[PDB]
Structure 1
Amino acid sequence: SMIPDFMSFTSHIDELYESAKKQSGGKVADYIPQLAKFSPDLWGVSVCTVDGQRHSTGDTKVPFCLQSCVKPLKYAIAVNDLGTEYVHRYVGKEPSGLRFNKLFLNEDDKPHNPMVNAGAIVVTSLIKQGVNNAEKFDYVMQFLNKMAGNEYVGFSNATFQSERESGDRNFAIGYYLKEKKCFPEGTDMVGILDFYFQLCSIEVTCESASVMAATLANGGFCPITGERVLSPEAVRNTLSLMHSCGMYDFSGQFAFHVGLPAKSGVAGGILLVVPNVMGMMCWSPPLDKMGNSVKGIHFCHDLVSLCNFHNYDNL
């Protein structure tokens, strides 16, 4: 363990939080009203060690949608229940060459990885096949509750309704994937898109999400309940992909300068994982040109520079 005195570490988090707060750049997403609503000044950071120790600063109890932050989570679910081999017969394992979410498959006609939209949609089509969307959703919700140690996990129907009503881009991807035979046989494509929009609309708080991150950072065991939620294989796979495909077009830079598994979302969230150390959720609505929370990105750089948490930092 690299945190001898938690109380002192906490004091540092507050300093970094305070410093990041001064970064007011960026634009709050506004393609749908449910996202445009948010104030650019909301800024929260919650920590949950593999130990179970907690600490929050800022707006850590204001609910917000996971959006893309849910991608690694549902992927982890798929691998947990189906295994690496099966899941990857449908999706790739690496960074798409060019632009993130450019819409095209790889050599084998599979979405490049679970973190791009086309890949997440395919992953969504693998979860609990056979049952209706109602049960599929309950199943995943239950799974997220376990990851969060039963802390806040809500749902935003307005985000859901708005996402579906204006999701022409996802429907295009939906039909494209169906024509390329990317879905398991007999898949109700439109039904999967519906399930996908719902998953993007699940709400969390920095506090509950930090626990989910902590579960990933703790070999798949929820730090505040001690129960096994995800298989070791699922966690390792998820972390590998968050390392290289979790920050959209900034993934390459992030891995190089921060070197930590992470996943951003258009709501301004950044699910951050420090292997065997802790889980975190940084949240601030204003996004940079690449879709990542401006304050969150600033905070992540500072965190690694201060505490030497970089994957390849020697210790």
Structure 2
Amino acid sequence: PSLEDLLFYTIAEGQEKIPVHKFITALKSTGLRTSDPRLKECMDMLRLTLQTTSDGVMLDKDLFKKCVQSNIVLLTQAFRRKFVIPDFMSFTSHIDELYESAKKQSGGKVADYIPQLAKFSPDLWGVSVCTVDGQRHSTGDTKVPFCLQSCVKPLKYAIAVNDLGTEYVHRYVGKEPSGLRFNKLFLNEDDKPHNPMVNAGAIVVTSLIKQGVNNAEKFDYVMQFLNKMAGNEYVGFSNATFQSERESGDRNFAIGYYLKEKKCFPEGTDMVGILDFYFQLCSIEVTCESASVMAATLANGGFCPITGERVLSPEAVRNTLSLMHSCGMYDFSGQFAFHVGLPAKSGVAGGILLVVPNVMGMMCWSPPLDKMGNSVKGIHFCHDLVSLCNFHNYDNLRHFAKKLDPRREG
């Protein structure tokens, strides 16, 4: 009977043959991009076919079988509406509306404590989606690079848990939110930083990754790791931001010395070098599009949805999503978990890394911040997104009132 065969009659509504562009247009409406790394054999074979047969340009039955047979499983799920969001085109129109609504919210202040971020216009606003099946959508300024800043904190925590395990990592860092009075304290009662998402905790996490090698290799180790999480889309580095972050980081130096004195680091830690490494990790650059793929790896249990590659252990991803839930949005963490109920991490450059587990990852970026440090338009977008769709952690998948569920339905 044959899968390439059946798939074949699906797209050939009636005629004996399929226009190439008709196949492509139907393929894009799944949400996949033609550049998807799991589709390269079929796409090369299609480009090749346009060369060796300029006459159609069209695909007989064993011809189309020749192109798609190597990527047939993925192509079948895509076309039999088996993806996690089957009517992706309708969903993206909602995302676009949410985008436009948030664009009207013009408040907030751009971070200005170093000139590498006071240059960023307050009117850039970008949102990117990548589902657990690699379906993609973007609107606004989603290819402009910006620094992860604290959005890097769960990514490096995930790396440490992946290489070292939960039990070892949390000998060094706690696993719960401070409470809003303990905002300003470096250590909890057990002389550990409260959790990996506060600066002091991220500084200790930074100190456990790849112990014993030097900083250059430590950085390459982590960059290699972010590449895989992003399915090899753009991961960069801002020396300009790193230089300025290192010359105005008095409070992180205050933290570093206190942790050294309280013996918070592993035996043999060069605290000043760990601080240097920490500033580097804050200066790693992404776009909305590449960061959204990183979020989707977290949404997808540690597998990069656009490569199929296993990147992080389930243990690492579960721990990470737990702490983003409860500690990821600074003093707004409790409010955010209550009203949004999604694991999220914000950073001072205006990014909000966001995870809808089992569904999708997003990156929202708009430089202006509210008093707590969260992007105004990202915060507004996140509330709206959950008002509209039953993605809240404690929404019910069967009884959800007037909320829309994009995992379903005609």
Question: In which range does the TM-score fall when normalised by the shorter chain?
Answer: over 0.9
* Shift of residue 70, structure 1, vs aligned partner: 0.1
* Per-residue deviation, residues 220-243 of structure 1 (Å, max 9, x unmatched): 000000010000000000000000
Contact preservation (8 Å) 1:128, 1:136: yes
Aligned to 1:272: 354
Give RMSD over aligned pairs: 0.8
Contact preservation (8 Å) 1:101, 1:117: no
* Shift of residue 99, structure 1, vs aligned partner: 4.6
Whichever of the two has the greater Rg, that structure is 2
* Per-residue deviation, residues 10-36 of structure 1 (Å, max 9, x unmatched): 000000000000000000000000011
Report the Cα distance in structure 1 between the residues aligned to 2:181 and 2:284, rounded to whole angstroms: 27
Report the Cα distance in structure 2 between the residues aligned to 1:287 and 1:3, rounded to whole angstroms: 31
Contact preservation (8 Å) 1:75, 1:120: yes
Contact preservation (8 Å) 1:29, 1:285: yes
* Per-residue deviation, residues 32-80 of structure 1 (Å, max 9, x unmatched): 0001110000000000000100000000000000000000000000000
* Per-residue deviation, residues 238-295 of structure 1 (Å, max 9, x unmatched): 0000000000000000000000000000000000000000000000000000000000
TM-score (norm 2): 0.76
Q: Describe the shift of the 1:138–1:55 C-alpha distance in structure 2 as closer, same or farther (beyond 3 A).
A: same
Report the Cα distance in structure 2 between the residues aligned to 1:17 and 1:68, rounded to whole angstroms: 23
* Shift of residue 134, structure 1, vs aligned partner: 0.1
* Shift of residue 106, structure 1, vs aligned partner: 1.0
Report the Cα distance in structure 1 between the residues aligned to 2:248 and 2:338, rounded to whole angstroms: 35
Report the Cα distance in structure 2 between the residues aligned to 1:100 and 1:81, rounded to whole angstroms: 30
Contact preservation (8 Å) 1:26, 1:286: yes
* Shift of residue 197, structure 1, vs aligned partner: 0.1
TM-score (norm 1): 0.98
* Shift of residue 98, structure 1, vs aligned partner: 2.8
* Shift of residue 104, structure 1, vs aligned partner: 2.6
1:244 to 2:314 alignment: no
Aligned to 2:207: 125
How many residues align? The count is 313
Contact preservation (8 Å) 1:273, 1:279: yes
* Per-residue deviation, residues 193-227 of structure 1 (Å, max 9, x unmatched): 00000000000000000000000000000000001
Q: Describe the shift of the 1:128–1:213 C-alpha distance in structure 2 as closer, same or farther (beyond 3 A).
A: same
Task: Look up the SS of the partner of 2:162 in the other structure.
Answer: helix
Contact preservation (8 Å) 1:100, 1:116: no
* Shift of residue 163, structure 1, vs aligned partner: 0.4
What percent of counterpart residues are identical? Answer: 100
* Shift of residue 4, structure 1, vs aligned partner: 3.1
Query: What runs of 5+ residues in structure 1 fail to find an aligned partner?
Result: none
Query: What runs of 5+ residues in structure 2 fail to find an aligned partner?
Result: 1-83, 397-410
Q: 1:55 aligns with which of 121, 134, 137?
A: 137
Q: 1:89 aligns with which of 151, 160, 171?
A: 171
Contact preservation (8 Å) 1:264, 1:293: yes
Contact preservation (8 Å) 1:103, 1:173: no
Contact preservation (8 Å) 2:186, 2:255: no
* Shift of residue 102, structure 1, vs aligned partner: 1.1
**Structure of greater relative contact order (alpha carbons < 8 Å, 6+ residues apart):** 1
Report the Cα distance in structure 1 between the residues aligned to 2:390 and 2:241, rounded to whole angstroms: 38
Contact preservation (8 Å) 1:99, 1:249: no
